[PDB]
Amino acid sequence: MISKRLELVASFVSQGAILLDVGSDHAYLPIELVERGQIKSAIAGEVVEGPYQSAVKNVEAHGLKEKIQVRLANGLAAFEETDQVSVITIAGMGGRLIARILEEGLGKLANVERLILQPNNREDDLRIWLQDHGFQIVAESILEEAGKFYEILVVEAGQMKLSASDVRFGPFLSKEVSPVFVQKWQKEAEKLEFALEERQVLVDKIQAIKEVLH
Ligand SMILES: C[S@@+](CC[C@H](N)C(=O)[O-])C[C@H]1O[C@@H](n2cnc3c(N)ncnc32)[C@H](O)[C@@H]1O
């Protein structure tokens, strides 16, 4: 049933957690996770009525009223420190909105063990942000689904000084340099050459891709 992307995200969720899933369409992720006993309880939070309603309903349907709360809230407003959240997933958004959300709610994060994040784009910018604000990446996955590529970033409390390669391609994605890693950046590399002395932004970009794949 559950999407293959949403599958990965779930797989980094600390066994026993209390989850907050920001932008939980349809509550699919907290729902599966509650169902397989991998988490204790959850909060699905959504920012507009459409999705909020959808999540409310699906939770009833799976009769999980007393295991998942659904809140119409914007980003981290969705919880307070009393909810005692251990893990937050934030999936299916732009890199920079993910940053803005973490940004506008940075306060709340001190007692949060882990942060599972699937940006849609702007993966680099998030990394710059995450570095600059006292977060370190502990784990990274990539996957293909139905044409589209999807980076997942697992994060904790910490310092990290990243290479400019590591911001662009990812600390862990370019360690174990997988096949899915390779088409992404390949596909992107020809996308570039296709385009090709501002015609120079590209050269080095292209060169960087050549380099991390080599
Ligand atoms: C591409 S969907 C992904 C939903 C789910 N996390 C997933 O990846 O499968 C983006 C969803 O994020 C929701 N969202 C919830 N809270 C948000 C917030 N606080 N700021 C921006 N988008 C938010 C939007 O309403 C929308 O339903």
Cα dihedral 11, 14, 18, 20 sign = negative
CA separation (Å) from 37 to 31, 42, 149, 174, 178?
Answer: 10, 12, 29, 33, 31
DSSP code of 156? E
**Residue 195 in 3-state DSSP?**
helix
Residue pair 182/213 in contact by the 8 Å Cβ criterion: yes
CA distance 135 to 168: 17
Ligand 1 nearest-atom number relative to CA 73? 19
Q: Which two tokens stand for residue 132?
A: 């600059």
Task: Name the residue type at position 83.
Answer: D
Q: Where are the domains of the chain?
A: 1-161, 162-214
Residue pair 192/209 in contact by the 8 Å Cβ criterion: yes
Method: X-ray
CATH 3.40.1350.10 fits 162-214, yes or no: no
Minimal-distance CA residue to ligand 1 atom 14: 23
Phi and psi at residue 191, to the nearest 5°: -45, -35
Minimal-distance CA residue to ligand 1 atom 5: 24
Per-state percent for the chain, helix, strand, coil, to nearest 5: 45, 25, 30
Q: Which two tokens stand for residue 32?
A: 């599966």
CA separation (Å) from 98 to 72, 79, 103, 104, 124?
Answer: 18, 16, 8, 10, 12
CA distance 14 to 86: 8
Architecture of the domain whose range is 1-161: 3-Layer(aba) Sandwich (3.40)
Q: Which two tokens stand for residue 7?
A: 């599958």
CA 114 to chain centre: 11
Cα–ligand 1 centroid distance for 6 (angstroms): 13
| Pocket of ligand 1 from Cβ distances under 6 Å | 6, 22-25, 45-48, 51, 74-75, 91-93, 97, 101
